[PDB]
Every structure is written in structure tokens, then in C-alpha cells.
Amino acid sequence: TSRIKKFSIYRWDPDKPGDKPRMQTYEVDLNKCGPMVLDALIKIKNELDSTLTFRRSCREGICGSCAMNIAGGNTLACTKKIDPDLSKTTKIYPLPHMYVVKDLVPDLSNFYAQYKSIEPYLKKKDESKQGKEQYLQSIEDRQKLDGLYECILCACCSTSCPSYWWNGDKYLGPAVLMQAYRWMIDSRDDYTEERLAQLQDPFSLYRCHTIMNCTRTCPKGLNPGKAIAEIKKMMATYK
Amino acid sequence: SKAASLHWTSERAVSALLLGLLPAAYLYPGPAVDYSLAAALTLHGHWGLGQVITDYVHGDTPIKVANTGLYVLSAITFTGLCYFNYYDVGICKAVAMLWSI
Amino acid sequence: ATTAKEEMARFWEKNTKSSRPLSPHISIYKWSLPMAMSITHRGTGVALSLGVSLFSLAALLLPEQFPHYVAVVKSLSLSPALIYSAKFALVFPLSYHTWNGIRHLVWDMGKGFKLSQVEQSGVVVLILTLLSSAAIASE
Amino acid sequence: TQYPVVDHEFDAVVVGAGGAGLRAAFGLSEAGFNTACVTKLFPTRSHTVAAQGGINAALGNMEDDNWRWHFYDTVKGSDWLGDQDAIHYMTEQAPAAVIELENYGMPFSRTEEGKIYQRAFGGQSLQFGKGGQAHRCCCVADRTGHSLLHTLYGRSLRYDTSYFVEYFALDLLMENGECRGVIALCIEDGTIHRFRAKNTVIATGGYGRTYFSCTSAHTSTGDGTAMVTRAGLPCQDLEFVQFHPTGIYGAGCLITEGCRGEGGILINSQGERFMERYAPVAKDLASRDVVSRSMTIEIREGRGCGPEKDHVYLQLHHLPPQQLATRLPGISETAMIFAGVDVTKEPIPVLPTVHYNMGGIPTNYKGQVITHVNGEDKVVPGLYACGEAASASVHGANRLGANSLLDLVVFGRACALTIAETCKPGEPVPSIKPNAGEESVANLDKLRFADGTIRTSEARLNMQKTMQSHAAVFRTGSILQEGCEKLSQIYRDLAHLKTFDRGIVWNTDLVETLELQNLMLCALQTIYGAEARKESRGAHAREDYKLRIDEFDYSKPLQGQQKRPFEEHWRKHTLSYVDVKSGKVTLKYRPVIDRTLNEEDCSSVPPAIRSY
Ligand SMILES: *Cc1cc2c(cc1C)nc1c(=O)[nH]c(=O)nc-1n2C[C@H](O)[C@H](O)[C@H](O)COP(=O)(O)OP(=O)(O)OC[C@H]1O[C@@H](n2cnc3c(N)ncnc32)[C@H](O)[C@@H]1O
Ligand SMILES: CCCCCCO[C@@H]1O[C@H](CO)[C@@H](O)[C@H](O)[C@H]1O
Numbered sequence A: 001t002s003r004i005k006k007f008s009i010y011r012w013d014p015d016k017p018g019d020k021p022r023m024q025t026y027e028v029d030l031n032k033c034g035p036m037v038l039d040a041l042i043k044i045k046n047e048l049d050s051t052l053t054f055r056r057s058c059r060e061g062i063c064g065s066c067a068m069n070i071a072g073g074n075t076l077a078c079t080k081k082i083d084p085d086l087s088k089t090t091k092i093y094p095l096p097h098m099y100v101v102k103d104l105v106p107d108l109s110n111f112y113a114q115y116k117s118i119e120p121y122l123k124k125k126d127e128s129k130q131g132k133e134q135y136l137q138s139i140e141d142r143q144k145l146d147g148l149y150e151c152i153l154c155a156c157c158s159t160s161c162p163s164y165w166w167n168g169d170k171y172l173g174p175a176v177l178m179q180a181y182r183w184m185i186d187s188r189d190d191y192t193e194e195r196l197a198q199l200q201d202p203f204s205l206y207r208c209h210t211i212m213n214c215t216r217t218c219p220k221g222l223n224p225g226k227a228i229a230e231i232k233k234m235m236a237t238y239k
Numbered sequence B: 001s002k003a004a005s006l007h008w009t010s011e012r013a014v015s016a017l018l019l020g021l022l023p024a025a026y027l028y029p030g031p032a033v034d035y036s037l038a039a040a041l042t043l044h045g046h047w048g049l050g051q052v053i054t055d056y057v058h059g060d061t062p063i064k065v066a067n068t069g070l071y072v073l074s075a076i077t078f079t080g081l082c083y084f085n086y087y088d089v090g091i092c093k094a095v096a097m098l099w100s101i
Numbered sequence C: 001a002t003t004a005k006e007e008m009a010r011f012w013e014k015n016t017k018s019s020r021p022l023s024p025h026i027s028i029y030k031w032s033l034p035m036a037m038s039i040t041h042r043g044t045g046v047a048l049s050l051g052v053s054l055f056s057l058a059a060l061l062l063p064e065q066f067p068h069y070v071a072v073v074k075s076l077s078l079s080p081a082l083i084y085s086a087k088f089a090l091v092f093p094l095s096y097h098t099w100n101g102i103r104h105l106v107w108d109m110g111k112g113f114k115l116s117q118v119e120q121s122g123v124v125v126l127i128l129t130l131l132s133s134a135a136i137a138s139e
Numbered sequence D: 001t002q003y004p005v006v007d008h009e010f011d012a013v014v015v016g017a018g019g020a021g022l023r024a025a026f027g028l029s030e031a032g033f034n035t036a037c038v039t040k041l042f043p044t045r046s047h048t049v050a051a052q053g054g055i056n057a058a059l060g061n062m063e064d065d066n067w068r069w070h071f072y073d074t075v076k077g078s079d080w081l082g083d084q085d086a087i088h089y090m091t092e093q094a095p096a097a098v099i100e101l102e103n104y105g106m107p108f109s110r111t112e113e114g115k116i117y118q119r120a121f122g123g124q125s126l127q128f129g130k131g132g133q134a135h136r137c138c139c140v141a142d143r144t145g146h147s148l149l150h151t152l153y154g155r156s157l158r159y160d161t162s163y164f165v166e167y168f169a170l171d172l173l174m175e176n177g178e179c180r181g182v183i184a185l186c187i188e189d190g191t192i193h194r195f196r197a198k199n200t201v202i203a204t205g206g207y208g209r210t211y212f213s214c215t216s217a218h219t220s221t222g223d224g225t226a227m228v229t230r231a232g233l234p235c236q237d238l239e240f241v242q243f244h245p246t247g248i249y250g251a252g253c254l255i256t257e258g259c260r261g262e263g264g265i266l267i268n269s270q271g272e273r274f275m276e277r278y279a280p281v282a283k284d285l286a287s288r289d290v291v292s293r294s295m296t297i298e299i300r301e302g303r304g305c306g307p308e309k310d311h312v313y314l315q316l317h318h319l320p321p322q323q324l325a326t327r328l329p330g331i332s333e334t335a336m337i338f339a340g341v342d343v344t345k346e347p348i349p350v351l352p353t354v355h356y357n358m359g360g361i362p363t364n365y366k367g368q369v370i371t372h373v374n375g376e377d378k379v380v381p382g383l384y385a386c387g388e389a390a391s392a393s394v395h396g397a398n399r400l401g402a403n404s405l406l407d408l409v410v411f412g413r414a415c416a417l418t419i420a421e422t423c424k425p426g427e428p429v430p431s432i433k434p435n436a437g438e439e440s441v442a443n444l445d446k447l448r449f450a451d452g453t454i455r456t457s458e459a460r461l462n463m464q465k466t467m468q469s470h471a472a473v474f475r476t477g478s479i480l481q482e483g484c485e486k487l488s489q490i491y492r493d494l495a496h497l498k499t500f501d502r503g504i505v506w507n508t509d510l511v512e513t514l515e516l517q518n519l520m521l522c523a524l525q526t527i528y529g530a531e532a533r534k535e536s537r538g539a540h541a542r543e544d545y546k547l548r549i550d551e552f553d554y555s556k557p558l559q560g561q562q563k564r565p566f567e568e569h570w571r572k573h574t575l576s577y578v579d580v581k582s583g584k585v586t587l588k589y590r591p592v593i594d595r596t597l598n599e600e601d602c603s604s605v606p607p608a609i610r611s612y
């Protein structure tokens, strides 16, 4: 016996540019497939259509490669359970409002350039002693980084944000802003004032209107929306 | 150099003000509240529609045209409200009258 | 290497002149209550502003003053149920915007960010909006 | 002419952007070299990002320590197949290497004094094995690799290194036995690129995907190892495959050995803490080869858990929930997602799972790739290797947990230091023939248009199931021989491959077929090397040859013993070669290096009986 589940997936081939984006339906026997959506995608590519294209690497939700939109929400295919209701067809699309390179693969180069622009690395006023001894950090100051350093840069949150959809050329987005915050509150970093000064323009930080799609969709359970609110408070009170 | 955070702070301060004017309109109807509302409603509204323009209008020319028209609308709006407060019954009383229907 | 600014310029130059489609968004994204309440806050804010601007404009352009128009409506002896309904519809967007505006100021102070708190504060705002509007429309 | 070629000139090219590649690439840029880093994945997606337990260094933050005690644990752990000059370099350089990462901002967990927190880990001791459990595994809760890779990536953004992301390296450009660069496919637009350079560093990771069940990423396909094999150079010790004691049952996801370091214990269907019987002293913190074999015997003997009696249990619920949340938050989440287990209430179902490759491209302790001709090691001009793709060999026949992340930053830095002391930036770029790399392009085109009878996924599954059933935890001659013959037939049948995507932009059907050719070259060398090695040492266990065979019988006094000739013992590294057209494997052997870098400061450790 079998339990046939249907998946409708977004297709577009840059080598046949003129054929408009379309949805293709595939039938998969859940009794012969792993429990996650990525398992079904790999089973389709291995047994039904090897032209189906998507990014993946770790299969355990840590690398951030397989982010896409499943059943209307952004998430990691490798940790998203297949819905076993056989009467419903699960729809799969690329991360929203992104240029499609091919099928489920988006161009993330602007997302990565935004990340580089906030200088995500430790800066001290005098770095000449680097490498000589461990810098000290108390348990209490280290605890301030929990909920911030775990980000896997999957872009699920920024691509679920309507402000990022309309102004992603100049709004940095939830993922990048939360990492700016992770460097602002690290006790070993000496450039907090300059990090905040970088956001003094109308777009970088201020296009956020607290919609909160970012925190709802994060596969790691983090809260970029709360981190953005903490930066806005610092921006308002620093000298 | 802190124009953006300053603007964000002013926007919240004015929102707070409007919040207080509502109760004050009910407890102390009169010219002070009437003109205060005229200014706060105009400023809160100006900045608010200003955020809407920033979010949805793109292109150097379209943005300048939009923001110029917004200034005109806010000007006419503050004028009309002040005019209504000077020559007519005023905001508080108008609301009480409308509710007596 | 390339600076972050040069990478962003190359990204736009390359994609705007390419054949790549833009993946769907608003048409396929699943809605939630907080998402719907967020665009409604904007919608009510804009409606309220247009309202104040029209009023202000009517003050400057109408022939008669306010009391005259109030008297004319009263003279029609409209159904009080219809009047009640009209008052509800007028105050509803203002009540909604005010209560949700307060919810926004509390976020600006950094509070109420857990997902469960976001959902609960949202439902509280809908309840307060309905209770306020019902109470005010009856007076 | 069907594929336009783009040429680039650099002082140095690094292939790989995991922990080893990034450290080597910005290490070269910080020394003034105009450097390129070519990687098939965006950097932070590399397998390094999945590492959990930690990185070892004798910082002495929890108790007094000595790097020479770490040196001793590593040599004994390697079952004397490790080269002691490289192990000396890595353990002595460890404290400085971990301090460098913390000063880059890596968010290590902390002690009450504000220093880096270190946990216990398997096979590490104080006082040259005589003094009890060491606590030298530095960590960021149980997400140490994720933090190390993200910290190194952020630091790389401060230099002028040129990154070529989503570029797939196809082959080395060799001329006169010297490497002069690499040729690659740009996945985003289908173009072929030739990176010319005076020095090339291979940091491409392992090949755990040659098996059916592994903790490895889908991208760990031995690509750099296969490039070296295709250039006619030898690979080393590929038969030594590490099975990690605890991959989660079913999915295969890793569950950190840090669980046992923090107090967790393994139990069988009768509730017995069985490691007390197999390793009376070290118990659940014995070396990986010993714990994996013990678990396998428990299951073979009928004490496995679950409806199929095919796995065992890792118990953490006797530990305080605050400790599980502070030290093991990542595996707590993974256990729930993949096995539906709440670790504060029930045990995690686990079993030995392929995890890491001790073998790889042979190098000396400075990171230079070597070959072996007429009994002498000889450096390959302009070629370096570091990380899991290399065999330095600091790990020998069994790697100690938390020694790989250390190997990545110590040897990634060493390749850069060695090039800086050998060359200067801007020297002239070596020339290559106008058609250099054409065979790589011809092979790519052949696969792109393949129209046979066996699709790539069918051949890959065939290879994976053969390795899983013929080269597992316990092996034997007749079973290894049948696996050798089955793999050799699958290799000849690649001539019948069938692909379907005929495009060139993001053709993953084609990229996965190139990866299958790379995996098969790694698989053949692994199983033929295993079949030839008639002894048991570290991770290689033969039921037909149960004893370790050294040049002397070290379980007896050496006085009056007759030393076995090189050809009659097994304490030597396996060197493997493959004729790519036929798939025929040839094996040769080279000596293990027992000398350290300074006998006076760190003495060589002679072979001894190895027990935990
Ligand atoms: C699998 C695993 C391993 C592991 C671990 C947990 C898991 C789930 N936890 C560890 C720990 O806590 N402590 C430790 O000491 N080791 C641990 N390990 C083992 C260790 O993580 C690995 O040995 C190590 O991370 C190796 O990294 P390395 O730098 O050698 O490489 P990689 O991260 O796998 O990255 C490979 C890079 O090479 C590029 N590549 C590969 N092929 C190509 C081609 N053809 N062309 C261009 N680039 C290529 C990849 O893109 C990648 O960047
Ligand atoms: C027209 C009114 C729109 C209301 C849409 C409600 O939408 C529902 O909201 C809840 C709570 O956020 C979510 O958990 C559901 O997944 C979502 O479908």
C-alpha cells in the first residue's frame, strides 16, 4: 500500500528564459520518503525529475542553505515536517521578492553585501596586543549574546519583511540589523558609538515598522524584531 | 549628525501628546486644546504620510514631487483647522455637536 | 576584494538588465493576525488624515458654517438605529488606531516582543476597539 | 571553443572556504599576497558550521595543564600511525591559536574568572595518561563550529582577498610535476575559469557521503582529494574512517560527544551502563574507535533498543536541566526535531555513524603536499593542503574529538606562513599551455549530455549501500573482497550514466554527477586499502586479523627482539593511486615519522599497548 502526497513547485529555467515561471505537480509516496520537506525534494530530484534545482547542504537546520517558502511561510526545508494530510497539495516557492537564478534558488548577493557593510567583526581601540592573551568577559556579559550569535544567515526573516520587499536596496533588514546589535552589545568591542552612527539616515534601520513577520518565521526561534527595538532605544539615548 | 534618531524621537513624543489631548479634549474643551489639536493632528499626520511616501514612492523626481505636495496639503490643513477654530465653533464643540445628532 | 558598496551596485546593474523574474511575495505569503493588524494600522492612519484634510478643506470652502449643516441633518429625522450605525463606523477607525498606537509605543519602549505577547496584545486591542466603539456610539 | 575560458592571475589560490580555507586565505592576504578563494558554497554553509563539541588547547583555565600532555593523548589516540613532528607543532601552537580566535571575537562560553570554559572530551588525560580526565576542549555551548566559521568569515571581510563563490573546482593545472593553479566551473553563469598562481592550497573537506548513513553534509564529496588522484599524485590512509559513537538513529545527525563530557552515559536495553565493562577507567569517554566498536557488539549480542533492536540510548536526564540548557542547547533542540525526544525526560536513540576521514592528501608538517619516490618523501612544488582534506598526519588511525577544528586553524595558518617564507608577493605567475585544462572541460561536456541507462542517483545509491555493508565498523577479508569487486563494477558502469538537465546555469544534475565521479575515486581507494591492510589499528578493525602489527611486539620487552622488516609489518601509511580510465587501484607504503620537532623539549612517544 501507499500514501501519495502532492507537491506543487515553482519552476523557471534561465537557459529557456522566454518560458514563463510555472508550477509543476509531483506525486510522492510518503511511506518511502523521510519525514521532512527536503527529503521529498531530494526524492523527486533522484527519482522523478533530476532537473528540479535547489540549494542544500547540512540537512539538520544549521547551515542555512535550504531556505524557501513552504505552505506560505519562509522556513528551512530540512526541518519542516511534510504535512501528511493527503487531500492537501503543499505549495513551494523561492524566498519572496528575490531575483530567481533558477527554480528555488534566489540571488542573495545584496543580502551578503549588506551584512559586510556593518563590519561584523571585533574592533578594539588598540588592536596591537591581539593574539597574546584571552580577553576577559564575565558570565553575565557573555549571556547578553544569547539569542543573537546563533543566527545562521538563512535570510528567512528579511525576505518575509514587507519593508525589505519595498526597500531592500537601502533598508538593511532584520538579519543584518540583529547582527549589528550583536556587535554593539559585545563587551569586548569598543566601537558602539560608531556602529550606531552608521544608522543615522532614513532607511538603514528606520524602515522597520514593527510588523514582526521576522520573529514569527525564524527557524532558529530568535527575535530580530526585539533586537531592532533595542537598537532604536540606543540610537535615541547615546551621546 | 543625529537627525534620524532625533526625528524618530520627535515622532513618538508627538504621538504621546495626541494621546493626552484626547482626554484633555473631553475634560477641558476650549481654545487651548483646540489649537493644540490643530497643530498635533497636522504634525503627526504630516510625518505619518511622510513615512508612507518614503516606503512606497521611488525615483528622485517622484519622491520630490510627492513630498512637495505633502507640504502643500499639510499647509492647507493647518490653515483650515486654525480658520475653523477662529471663525467657527472649534474642534471640541464640533465633535460634541456632531454626536448630538 | 570589492567594497560592500560596489557589490550592491553590481547586484542592481546585473539583475535589472537580466531576464530573471522576481519571485512572488504578497500574493503567496501566509497572513497572520499581527500582519493584518499592521497594515490596518497604516490604513486607518491614512484614512484619518484624509478625513482631517477634507474637514479642514470643507471649512474653507463651504458657504455655511458647521451648525447649519448639523441642523439640516437633524431636520431629516433619520432612524436612530441608522445614526447609531454611522457613529460606530466613524469612531471605529479612530478607536482602532489609538489602541494599536498605544501597543506601538509600548514596543518602542522595548516591551511585549515574545510571539505569545504579540498575539495576545493584538487580540486585546481588537476587544478594546470593539468595546470602545460600541460604548461611544451609544452616547 | 564551445566554452569560452576566462583567465585570472593571482599570487595564490585557496580552494575551500571552511575553517581551514578561510584561515589560509586571509592568512595569505594579511602577509601581502594577492589571493583568490574559490568555493562551491557561500562560506558559512561549509560543514565546519555544523561542528559542536569544541576545539582543544592546553590553556589551563579549569586546572593546571601542559601542551605536552595534549601531545601525548594525540599520539596514543592515533595508535602510533600519527606523525609526531606534526602533532608536536599542532599541540604546542594550540593555546596561541585559540587565543587568536577569541581575540577575533569568537563568543566562547565563560568561567567564573571570565576566561574560556573548557569541557572534558574523549581520550584526553592529565600527566601523560596517568593523572585523570583532562578538561581542555574550549567551546561555545554545543555550537562551536558555527561560531568559529562565522567569526573567521567576518574577519576575512577586513582583507583584500578575492572570493569566487559557487565556483566548482574541476582539476589542478599541473606542469612538470608542479601545480600552477586550478580550473573551475562558475555555477551561476556556466563559464569556465582558470586561476593561475604560484601556490595553490587545497582545503576541500572530507568524503563521508561515500556511505549510506553519515553525519556529513550532502556537500562532503571528496572533490579536492579526487583532483589530486586525477593529477596522478598519491592519497594517504583513506581506509581509516571514523565512526562517531553517537549519530541520531534514523536521520544520522550528530549528537555531540560533549554530552558524555558533561556527564551523559550510554545504556543498552537492560539499562546497563555498558562502557564500564569495555573501558573500566575511561568508560563513555574512551576513544571513538573503542566506543563505536563496543556499541556495535552490544547490538550484535542482542541488547539493542527499539522495536528493531538496532540502536542504543544516550541518557542525559539525570543531569540538572539548567546544565542541559547552558551547555547543550543545540542538541536539545535537534533531539526534539528529529527523534521527538525531550532530553530532560527520555534518552536519545543513537548508533555509530560515519563522520570524519583520517586519510586525505599527504603533507609534511608545514602543509606542503608530498609524494614518495624510491623510498623518499618529496615536496610537490606550489601545492599545499590543510583541514580534513589533508593527512599531515596529526590523527593517524583515530582522531580525538575536538582536534579537527584545531587542525583547521593551525595548519591553515601554517600553509600561509610557509608560503610567506618561501615566496614574495608579485613574483611572476607561472605559465600554462594555451589548452591547459581541456580534458576537464571535455569530461564536463560528456556528463552534461550523457544519455545512457543508469541515472546518477542509482549509481550513487549503489556505491553508498556497498560501502555501508562491506566496509563498516568490523570488517573481514571475504566481505571486503566482495565489496571491492562490486565497487569496481559500479565504476566501469559509469560509462552508462544518464543525466537529464541539458542546461549550464545551475545544473545541479551535472554538478552531482561530477561529485559522484569524485566520491567513487575516494570509495575505491578506501575499500582496496582496507582489504590490503591485514591488522587491526585504530578505526580499522579486522575480525580475521585482530592484532595491531608493529615493527616490534611492544607488549613484550624489546631486549633481544628481532625487528620486523618494513614489508613485514603494518606500522606505516598506505599510499593509494588510481588509473582513472580503468579504475585500477595501486598501493605503496611510506614510514610513519616518530621524531618530534625538538627531542629535548618534547620527547617522542614509543608505541605501547593501547587501552582506555
Ligand atoms: C560532520 C561534523 C564534523 C565535526 C563536528 C560535527 C559534525 C556534524 N564537530 C566537531 C567539533 O566539535 N570539533 C572538531 O574538532 N571537529 C568536529 N567535526 C569535524 C570537523 O568539523 C571537520 O573535520 C572540519 O570542519 C573540516 O573543515 P574543512 O575546512 O576541512 O572543510 P569543510 O568545512 O568541510 O569545508 C570544505 C570547503 O571546501 C569547499 N569545496 C569542496 N569541494 C569543492 C570544489 N569542488 N570546488 C570549490 N570548493 C569546494 C566547500 O565549498 C567548503 O567551503
Ligand atoms: C480578514 C481578517 C484576516 C485574519 C487572518 C488570520 O490568520 C491566522 O492568524 C493566526 C494568528 O496569528 C495564525 O496562527 C494562522 O496561521 C493565520 O492563518
Ligand SMILES: O=C([O-])[C@H](O)C=C([O-])O
Binding pocket: D051, D052, D053, D054, D244, D254, D255, D256, D257, D258, D356, D400, D401, D402, D403, D404, D405
Ligand atoms: O562530538 C562532537 O562534538 C564532535 O563530532 C567533535 C569531533 O571533534 O568530531
Ligand code: SF4
Binding pocket: A150, A151, A152, A153, A154, A155, A156, A157, A158, A174, A175, A178, A217, A218, A219, A220, A221, A222, A224
Ligand atoms: S534571524 Fe533567524 S531567520 Fe533571520 S537569518 Fe538569522 S536564523 Fe535566519
Ligand code: F3S
Binding pocket: A160, A161, A162, A163, A164, A173, A174, A207, A208, A209, A210, A211, A212, A213, A214, A215, A224, A225, A228
Ligand atoms: S518584519 Fe520587518 S518591519 Fe521590522 S519587526 Fe520585522 S524587520
Ligand code: FES
Binding pocket: A055, A056, A057, A058, A059, A060, A061, A062, A063, A064, A065, A066, A067, A076, A077, A078, A079
Ligand atoms: S540544508 Fe542546511 S539549513 Fe537546511
Ligand SMILES: [K+]
Binding pocket: A183, A184, A185, A186, A187, A188, A189, A190, A191, A192
Ligand atoms: K560594546
Ligand SMILES: [K+]
Binding pocket: D357, D358, D359, D360, D387, D388, D389, D390, D391
Ligand atoms: K583527513
